[PDB]
Amino acid sequence: AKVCYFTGRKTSSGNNRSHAMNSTKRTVKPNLQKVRVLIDGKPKKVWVSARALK
Amino acid sequence: ELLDVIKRPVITEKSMLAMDEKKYTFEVDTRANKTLVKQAVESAFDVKVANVNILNVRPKFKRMGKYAGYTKKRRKAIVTLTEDSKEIQ
Amino acid sequence: KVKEIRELTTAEMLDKEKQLKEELFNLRFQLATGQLENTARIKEVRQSIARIKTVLREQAN
RNA sequence: AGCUGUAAGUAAGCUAUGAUCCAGAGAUUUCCGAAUGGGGGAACCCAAUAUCUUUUAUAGGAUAUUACUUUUCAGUGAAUACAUAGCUGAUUAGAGGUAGACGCAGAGAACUGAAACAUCUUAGUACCUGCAGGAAGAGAAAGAAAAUUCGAUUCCCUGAGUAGCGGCGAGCGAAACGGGAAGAGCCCAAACCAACAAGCUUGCUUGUUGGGGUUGUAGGACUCCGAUAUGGUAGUCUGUUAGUAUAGUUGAAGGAUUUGGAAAAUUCCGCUAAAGAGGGUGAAAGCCCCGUAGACGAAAUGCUGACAACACCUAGGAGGAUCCUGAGUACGGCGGAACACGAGAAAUUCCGUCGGAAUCCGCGGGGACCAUCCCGCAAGGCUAAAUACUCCCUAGUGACCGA
RNA sequence: GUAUGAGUAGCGAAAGACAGGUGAGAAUCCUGUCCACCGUAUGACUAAGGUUUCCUGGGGAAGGCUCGUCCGCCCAGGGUUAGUCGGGACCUAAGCCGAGGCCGAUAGGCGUAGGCGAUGGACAACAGGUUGAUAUUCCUGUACCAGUUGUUUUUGUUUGA
RNA sequence: UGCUUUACUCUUUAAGGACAAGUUGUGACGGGGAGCGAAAUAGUAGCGAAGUUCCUGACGUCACACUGCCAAGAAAAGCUUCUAGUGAGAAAACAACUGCCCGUACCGUAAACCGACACAGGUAGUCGAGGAGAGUAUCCUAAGGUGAGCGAGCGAACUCU
């Protein structure tokens, strides 16, 4: 899971508060799936988000 | 380019003693084979093979004026002959 | 020096190149053995070869 | 009219046929280094294919081409036939460095403060990394307002330590109105019509080229009449001139005496000034020298104006049946961030996931929310100047330093 | 920069004596004789490491734990020669870089084919002489390995060459 | 036709094959040597006599050869054959020529390396003699190399050996 091939989704980072507002650092990552798609007719395998599978 | 092969003859105490057996002490520029020196000598003096010998020299210090510097690298060449002489030097 | 060098043909340039290199051999061996009251002829042969090579540079563009 | 650097010293020479020196254009440029034929412990070693060379001949020498990836075009190809991997050849672009500066992003601390310390602050600072440019970023209203309105952005003064946020503690802290600097607006997607190809059932759907078309007072298609002019440019390193940058030329006027080693110092009598700023000379000079004020000057290369040419771009009036106006977008739940705003009564902007609209009788906003009114059309791009910095160049200045 | 400590502590394990030299100057330099020490090492040869300390001729300002005519010190000149020795134009172990490739906020991490890498494998020369310094390197004699040019006795590219 | 392997028949201290330290000639009329010694100012140049027998005798060499044991003891190239193939006619003898790049002086149980020093410390490998002796122990010695980089007096306290 590194990028999207169609959209521009990539992994990132943000805080994490818990019930007395102590902050740490997360790794917020997108849902990604290895999908066989038809790039210029020739099939590849590539990472596509599930958001573009609607 | 074989006139930049040989530079000078060496005139020392052993080099004059090499003259008695048809052996001559030249300074050849760096990165030169034995074969270039044979071809250059045969071009410039009409003599033959009886193979060359080739040395190298590591440099030295000198000091003049609170300064410290090396000298050049060198490369000798002790060329032997078969049949001719060089009363040229 | 320049002008009569610009008067020659093409091959005579190469002939004078060979003659001046042989004079440089002779001035080297006659410097090593303690000779040559003229030592200021060594710049002249070098700069003559230089001027000849620039003249041959210009004529072949 | 003297010259061969520092640097004396010797010995050789050069120049009136104009040296040395200065300025603008050229030529040559060993080997390592992104290093790029292969290798390596940088400045080394070892190759391949052509061509020309030395020797009776192999050995020896010289020149040119040979990395990787991708942009395009050919051949070649095959698990498996059709053709896709792949291979080969040609063609197009990159690859590293600084200026220890200025800009935009990703990721992101601790000591310290709170007289301790957990949310908070230090602080999105220091450090790393990517991406550029001479500037970057932002920029043509889904805006600021509350009328009686104004019309892209940036920067400065003022609003103001005000309204606000905050274990409401330490502390953080705006924006609009007003005055100025500088001023500028353009191009698409769609709906429509042609030229071609395809399942063309010859239904005329899809795809490419060319015309059309760019908005809120809604505008465009489409229809009917006009009409073929007017006017701008944020291009063309194409010309023709004006200027300027890099060598320069010329440039006024004083003598004697005393003390002196030596006078510019002193004492008499003069002269100059579009020049009495400065430096040098055996001590302190308007009149000794270098200069300064003024005046003049460019073969060569670069730069900036100008105005010619050439490129571009730009039409009116009325009608309103039908059609078009940016989609997994707007928006909602959940979890985080950005807004001065720490979930707070929390609008507006993003990010991850899961749900998910309407089409002008429409849609957004005016700090939860509803109704009324007012102001505006998102989900497509481009854009000069006013602004910040100085590695380096030229010319200057300082109640800045004097080992 | 200069004192006090103070002309004090120290002078870094070991056996020297005399005669004759040179010289302005001698226990400390040269020469001669006798004595003494190590002798599985204080004797010989090489691998690292050092980088001209090597040899010849001069010099005595500083260095030498004293002196010094001497020196590994200062000045000037001069010496290291390879078809066969050790390495390259041969091979691979540990390990490292690793076209494509597989992962990963950037940076980058790991890895097939192919490589690089001796402490190992494989490989053709022996004795003597010579100088102030070099010697399986120079010369003396006798060999060996791989080639190239003229001579030497065999033909379909079927191989029967 | 090379290599591997299964069944059957013979064959066996036999035969075939493979390796081998070493010896004898040649090299060699050569150079080596106890000692003599000039022709100038050199023990220099030049001249050389013997080369025997017995005793001890190696983990140096055959050679990891042989027996035994379990902890079960590197790879790739060089080399050798057989075919695939390529495919004028090369292959012995003789003679003459060619064979590239880097290191080579010196010190190297030290005064020249590692310790700030001309320092009682450390430094991998090979050779390592004689009389006694198991021996590389210990004592004295050969070949060789040193006499230590402050001394001269006196012979009290005290400290060390």
Side-chain angles (χ1 to χ4, degrees):
Chain A
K2 54 180 289 184
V3 291
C4 284
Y5 189 76
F6 300 99
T7 57
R9 272 75 184 273
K10 67 187 289 185
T11 169
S12 64
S13 66
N15 292 324
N16 199 168
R17 297 289 178 89
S18 64
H19 191 72
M21 305 298 289
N22 295 317
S23 63
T24 61
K25 298 289 185 178
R26 283 180 58 87
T27 57
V28 174
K29 292 190 284 184
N31 202 165
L32 285 171
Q33 294 293 111
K34 283 176 95 286
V35 185
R36 178 177 292 116
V37 302
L38 299 177
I39 300 168
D40 292 331
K42 296 195 287 184
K44 295 291 288 183
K45 294 180 76 70
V46 72
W47 298 93
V48 180
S49 294
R51 187 71 174 171
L53 293 177
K54 287 181 179 289
Chain B
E1 73 278 17
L2 44 94
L3 290 177
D4 288 331
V5 175
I6 306 169
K7 285 182 66 177
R8 303 175 189 179
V10 181
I11 300 169
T12 55
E13 303 176 358
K14 284 183 69 173
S15 67
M16 298 302 289
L17 298 176
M19 304 289 285
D20 292 332
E21 299 179 355
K22 291 183 181 181
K23 296 190 181 185
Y24 297 95
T25 60
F26 295 112
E27 291 194 357
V28 172
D29 285 327
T30 69
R31 290 180 184 174
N33 302 321
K34 290 187 177 184
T35 58
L36 280 179
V37 179
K38 292 184 185 180
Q39 292 174 354
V41 168
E42 291 177 351
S43 69
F45 296 101
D46 295 331
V47 211
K48 292 179 182 178
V49 203
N51 301 316
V52 190
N53 290 314
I54 283 175
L55 285 165
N56 283 317
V57 168
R58 291 172 181 170
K60 295 180 182 178
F61 262 10
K62 284 186 181 179
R63 280 181 173 172
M64 297 289 289
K66 304 174 184 178
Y67 302 112
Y70 282 178
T71 62
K72 302 177 185 179
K73 285 186 179 180
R74 289 173 187 169
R75 172 175 282 184
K76 296 182 183 179
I78 300 168
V79 181
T80 73
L81 306 179
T82 52
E83 289 170 355
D84 273 331
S85 65
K86 294 181 184 182
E87 286 187 354
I88 309 169
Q89 306 170 358
Chain C
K1 51 175 292 298
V2 174
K3 293 172 69 70
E4 66 269 17
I5 276 89
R6 289 175 182 171
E7 290 181 352
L8 297 173
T9 67
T10 59
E12 301 169 355
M13 307 297 287
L14 297 174
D15 301 332
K16 285 185 97 289
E17 286 189 355
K18 292 180 183 178
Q19 292 178 357
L20 291 169
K21 280 188 177 180
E22 295 176 355
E23 290 189 359
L24 277 177
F25 243 184
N26 289 321
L27 293 176
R28 284 177 179 172
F29 284 184
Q30 293 174 358
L31 268 177
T33 65
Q35 287 178 356
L36 291 180
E37 299 177 356
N38 276 316
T39 62
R41 289 179 178 175
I42 305 168
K43 281 190 176 182
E44 295 179 356
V45 183
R46 292 175 180 174
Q47 290 184 356
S48 64
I49 289 175
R51 291 168 186 168
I52 288 170
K53 291 183 77 171
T54 59
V55 168
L56 292 180
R57 178 76 273 170
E58 290 180 354
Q59 291 183 357
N61 292 320

